């Protein structure tokens, strides 16, 4: 006995999502079902899910009930407290379908409210700026990736990061290295952690790869790019700045003040349809 | 300037396809476009494409123009001469949408005509039997996978195979081994080759993994299962038989006579929609 769910597919710097419209709040998917859908072969395939729902109808939220809420699920069914690339696609979706009518608006997330600015938008593409709030640098920790250690900044962007700027690493060296789920200090990161490997600041740019909690390597990670841009700035001895972060799925521009931070990048809406899945 | 293409997503033992309806024969996709679509993040994601077209309107075919033709493309844009799992999903599609009206019919492929029998069918599931023709054992060759050599049968099933039955290998040992694109004799396989690693016959069953030409590891390979079932039977000293082949995405039953061979397995239709893609 299978359900038929309307959906759209999209990405933001090739970090890709399945959008489930759910204003009547009748598709709070179980984690098994999330897994099934984010399986490319068995389902559709994605890095995770954006279920579109009002804050009024989302369990555990206490943000303004009148806002749209970005119910993000990771590909393993795991919840997460924020998703930078997600927020951009979610904004793109809402605007482009006329579910809001300003280029500038607030969205609810599991880390609270996030403001967005639509800079450019079609049916299929957009550029979105996100107020990401203040990066809270949590301390210093390390990880091991494939019997080699790196030292990083803990950063809280809503969710946890370990941003390891690597002294001397070229971009081509970085493209080459082979990643395995890192191992980290579980007292420091009791809930798991997103890890970013980063090149040092140069021409106001860094290059990054990332091993997402819940998911594995992704072609981009928006909260992680901001984490990386802190780390790169801190390693150059600044704490304000504008940094272009280069990820396997593209480019974003992060901006860091003392009062806050922003993440500006593209978003794309690739497909619409309906999908089959089994309850059991 | 982007095209909007109606499509369906489906699989056959988790070897998954994008179905493009194209009776007016106006979507002979270029290989770049195939690649874009079979990219999960950038497009939809699949092991390959089944474009649905009449034999009349397919370049290079000389089969009966009145038949439906399975225009199969691999995920790298590469054409291929047959696709076993594809044929089952293609039959499922045609029947279930009422584009044929018999449970038993002929389909055109790049290896010529293939007969099919629909055994069970819904909107969403089916069991299909395929007349695969005669396995032609081409000789003996070897390959290397990750600095280790295996010896195999060359088999022509339409397309080329190297079926390596491995003396002593358990299923759990097989689940464990780590695969890399094999290296093979290019005089023997001037066009590339599908490689199957197989366990010895036991309880009329073998277990198999496969590194598809054009694609890489797949959860199943229908022509390869028949290749594997020959090899396993030959290594047990028979040349007729009924063999259950176990693949990471499930199970199929292959049957071998002297007059021919059949492949019976499941098929599923997971989603319908429309997708965006760029000409340039
Ligand atoms: N790709 C997302 C990250 C999702 C976070 C999730 N992987 C986690 O914290 O577990 C981003 O744009 O920020
Ligand atoms: N998965 C397909 C194999 C496609 C063959 C293609 N990989 C090639 O010959 O290059 C099958 O069911 O037989």
Numbering used by the authors:
A (entry chain A), B (entry chain A): 1 to 280
Show passages lifted from the paper.
DapF (EC 5.1.1.7), a pyridoxal 5-phosphate-independent amino acid racemase, catalyzes the stereochemical inversion between l,l-DAP and d,l-DAP. DapF plays an important role in the biosynthesis of l-lysine because DAP decarboxylase only recognizes d,l-DAP. Each CgDapF monomer consists of two distinct domains: an N-terminal domain (NTD; Met1–Asp131 & Gly268–Ile277) and a C-terminal domain (CTD; Met132–Thr267). Two catalytic cysteine residues are positioned at the active site, which is located at a cleft between the two domains.
To investigate the substrate binding mode of CgDapF, we determined the crystal structure of the protein in complex with the d,l-DAP product. In fact, although we added a mixture of the three DAP enantiomers (l,l-DAP, d,d-DAP, d,l-DAP) into the crystallization solution, we only observed density consistent with d,l-DAP in the electron density map. We suspect that the l,l-DAP substrate was converted to the d,l-DAP product during the crystallization procedure because we used the wild-type protein. The substrate binding site is located at a deep cleft formed between the two domains. It can be divided into two sub-sites, a catalytic sub-site and a recognition sub-site, where the d- and l-amino moieties of d,l-DAP are positioned, respectively. The two catalytic cysteine residues are located at the catalytic sub-site, and the amino group in the d-amino moiety is hydrogen bonded to the carboxyl group of Glu212. The carboxyl group of d,l-DAP on the side bearing the d-amino moiety, is stabilized through hydrogen bonds with the main chain nitrogen atoms of Gly84, Asn85, Gly222, and Thr223, and the side chains of Asn85 and Thr223. In the recognition sub-site, the carboxyl group of d,l-DAP on the side bearing the l-amino moiety is stabilized by direct interactions with the main chain of Arg213 and the side chains of Asn74, Asn159, Asn194, and Arg213. When we superimposed the apo-structure of CgDapF with that of the complex with d,l-DAP, it became evident that substrate binding had induced the CTD to move towards the NTD. In addition, the interactions between the reorganized CTD and the residues located at the entrance of the active site cleft result in a completely buried substrate binding site.
